[PDB]
Design a protein around this ligand. Structure first.
Ligand SMILES: C[S@@+](CC[C@H](N)C(=O)[O-])C[C@H]1O[C@@H](n2cnc3c(N)ncnc32)[C@H](O)[C@@H]1O
Ligand SMILES: C[S@@+](CC[C@H](N)C(=O)[O-])C[C@H]1O[C@@H](n2cnc3c(N)ncnc32)[C@H](O)[C@@H]1O
Ligand SMILES: C[S@@+](CC[C@H](N)C(=O)[O-])C[C@H]1O[C@@H](n2cnc3c(N)ncnc32)[C@H](O)[C@@H]1O
Ligand SMILES: C[S@@+](CC[C@H](N)C(=O)[O-])C[C@H]1O[C@@H](n2cnc3c(N)ncnc32)[C@H](O)[C@@H]1O
Lengths: 275, 275, 275, 275
């Protein structure tokens, strides 16, 4: 189900994300570069969310059409495009509901897109409901299909290898989500038959105010992720392109070499479809 | 929550347990031997259940009073009593409801029992719902207070150390549950905040028949236990008697020496009150 | 759904019913008289419940076998039996589980009973979940089939005609339930597609004590019945015996003539199998 | 709670409404007339829903700012304003979330509005949660407060007098909702202590396609209303204006005289606040 249905997460996301100028500060020069370095104007955002990155591309004047499964979150991307409905770029910003699993129809690529982006550890949200990675394969497949030949694919996932290994994630220098308000996170790892199956996080977001000066009282929600490990996604994602693609994985938007000292929080998988 | 409220476990429990014969085959000697060695006549079975173990001691001429929290299970025990209500022993059997959490008031020990047995890995059914082993430490105490000075306490639990170590329990030499009817059992360990909070298994007891020869359709029920580790249980159980006790831990009805090659399926803890 | 699964009704049922004395005070004469008039020795109580009515007949030297679908309730009957298990009559009492919907296989009548009683407005507990009185018409049948040719069937129900008529039931002269402890009972009638589908009432049994003298805190439970109207029940019940029966309907343990000024609180239906 | 939370009703509303050109055909000339006959340009729509009527007013060039409690429905109003964002009238169409109960703040009228509209039997959606019509009074009150002195108020409610009396509504010539797809409606009336309290309708909407040519398979949802009777709303609504207002009720947008032959589906209450 849409873990964002109760729109409580989407309610504090602005806060949950933390500083946008800062969150976006990291990797903004690299994405905009890579996207331009391959000369892509047509960009589809499959995890638009509230639209933090889409808006960025809109502003940097690309042709972005963004989709997302939760209208609760989308609802906000929408508000922005409206407030900025006078800005020509934004008058052309596209926002539609869509689901990776049924994307094939949800968003007719036909021509395809110059680049496809699925940032902020979204895909990890898709669960292994069937036991087999069937769905994951399908989802990934449909995304790969949105990229025009020679197009790109920028998808990532938190470093679950480190999180699973030390049973705890590496917080601090977390590029996508840093807020002085996240007062609590209770991690819950459920492994079945010795296979990590679900990682459930119970959040506590400190909403400014909460009554008198500096007083407890926050917003709570919970998100569950699949702990995708590098090796597996690497292959899995590649297999999505039918093998006809160029694969490249980064640490936290820096070159990543297996067995390296630095432990990245996320793993940015960049893909170039050749067929 | 009462794992037996739906009454799926009890209805086929008889099969789940298997041949009481082979069930009792083993330690009916051991058990009978340990209570007698300490001259235990008045026994209290805080985990009566279907009544298996309680019935025996009864049949073996003991003064037994058995209590359980689940009437669905207790009722079958009761059932047996009525059937054999002409036999003086049985007419002398006491079957009643009680809950470890409130044992102190449910079953008025006053003087105490010669030996209180909690066999069957019944304790591991008690969750740590509070988060801190408060309830456990509590239940274990109340029980302990039913044991008279010098008396005994025989409480066991599966070997969750190995289970938790390998993510998979060892199915073999199950002295308490052995059948040809178990068709589906899968392991799901759930650990929160880096601590194993619970172990879930899905049970499928193929009840004789299920249609013509060669037809599916058996009873379905799954259970969830608390992976109690040796060390913690050892500590946990002895504090129940406030340190005034003689602790003894056995492998599979055999002494247990740490590091010993043998992998015990269960762990039988034997205590002797001294205060 | 089993209205007694939570076991709130039974726990205080004793109080809900009131003084069995006054309870039985009335129709213990009536009942005792009707069965004897037809020389009914072997009786089956398909609504045993706590065992109130069943116990009496037993105490009144009858050959009674009682069944009920709710063990929570049956257990208390059972309890009684064990307590008085030395009295030949009781040791001869049969208490078992059964469900009208499947009575035919639950209780093997074979020969049949002299008289089958279903007093207490127990039937109105059976909802029309299907939409069509399919289940009712069914349950009523299975019951009927437990009655031997010439035997009897005494099944009753509250006067839902008046209830449904005035939206409010008449609280007075309750031969089955009279107490000073009932603190809250509100009427909610639900009719779908222009037909009264259900009547719901909220029960509050003020259990003695609830703290010091003058302190709230009683048990809380509410029930829902099927407003069975006279006509339909008359029709419904007779068809159960396939027209081959002698129907008789009484007011409040008194004959009932349509239009009669008196408002019966209950309706006792008396049938005599002739086929 | 927002009965439109599962947005399934909002999903088929387009179909549920039926033909808009037709639905709007009735009463379009009358509303546009009365709104102009009193020269109102500033109109607030408190039950915007998908915005069927707001859009109308927008198109007919009025100054409409529409609010509604369910963002699921609002979501669609929004989509339209965007598609027609190039249309000057529409570029100024206002859509915000708001709840009658807390309207006072949700929408600052201050100046107030020339006219307020609450059509399509929306208000009936507000339940009597407190037993007293408290909430109803508050809600209504807040709405009355949105109307500028001399402003108007057009609120309606289905004819529950006829529905309640014949336990069945008068379908056919239903102005607001007529679709050749509504394959099923199961009415459920719940009266408590002889007072109609809730009318629950379980809908079945035939969504074109459903597989092969003409094949079953529809969308289902359920709405619950309060059965407001003419007399009561008349007074209730008037009292909302503090008595300082002009009251007028129509049948189906035609003069309505008590005890009249023609039985209306809806009762259009038109109000003129004078103070
Ligand atoms: C963590 S949020 C993204 C936040 C945003 N990317 C950012 O960086 O702030 C994950 C998003 O994944 C989307 N999502 C999850 N499963 C999806 C699916 N199957 N199809 C489409 N979107 C999905 C959700 O609706 C949610 O907005
Ligand atoms: C595995 S069963 C026992 C089976 C039985 N030992 C045998 O060998 O057939 C565990 C029992 O623990 C009991 N139990 C669990 N929590 C309890 C509690 N708090 N108080 C009393 N009994 C409890 C249940 O009612 C259940 O019958
Ligand atoms: C009001 S109680 C009877 C109380 C009892 N007559 C007395 O006077 O105390 C109704 C009984 O109907 C029984 N009952 C309801 N549906 C049943 C069914 N389908 N089969 C058997 N018993 C059923 C319940 O278990 C419940 O005990
Ligand atoms: C039947 S729909 C309206 C359809 C639309 N008026 C038409 O004619 O097609 C009723 C609307 O009332 C709204 N509603 C219900 N209770 C509300 C409240 N307390 N405040 C604001 N809107 C409310 C819902 O969100 C829903 O859109």
């Amino acid at each position: 189900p849409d873990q964002y249905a109760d729109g409580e997460a989407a309610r504090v996301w602005q806060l949950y994300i933390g500083d946008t100028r800062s969150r976006t500060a990291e990797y903004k020069a690299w994405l905009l570069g890579l996207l331009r370095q391959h000369g892509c104007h047509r960009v589809l955002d499959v995890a638009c969310g509230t639209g933090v990155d889409s808006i960025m591309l809109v502003e940097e004047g690309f042709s972005v059409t963004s989709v997302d499964a939760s209208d609760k979150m989308l609802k906000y991307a929408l508000k922005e495009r409206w407030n900025r409905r006078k800005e020509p770029a934004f008058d052309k910003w596209v926002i539609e509901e869509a689901n990776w699993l049924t994307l094939d129809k949800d968003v007719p690529a036909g021509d395809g897109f110059d680049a496809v982006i699925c940032l902020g550890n979204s895909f990890a949200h898709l669960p292994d409901s069937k036991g087999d990675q069937s769905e994951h394969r399908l989802a990934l497949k449909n995304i790969a299909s949105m990229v025009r030949p020679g197009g790109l694919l920028v998808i990532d996932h938190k470093n679950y290898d480190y999180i699973l290994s030390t049973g705890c994630a590496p917080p601090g220098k977390n590029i996508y989500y840093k807020s002085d308000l996240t007062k609590d996170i209770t991690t819950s790892v459920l492994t079945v038959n010795n296979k990590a199956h679900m990682v459930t996080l119970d959040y506590t977001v400190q909403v400014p105010g909460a009554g008198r000066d500096g007083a407890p009282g926050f917003s709570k929600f919970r998100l569950s992720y699949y702990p995708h490990c590098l090796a597996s996604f690497t292959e899995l994602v590649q297999e999505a392109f039918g093998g006809r693609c160029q694969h490249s994985v980064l640490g936290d938007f820096k070159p990543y070499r297996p067995g390296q000292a630095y432990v990245p929080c996320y793993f940015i998988h960049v893909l170039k479809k050749t067929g």
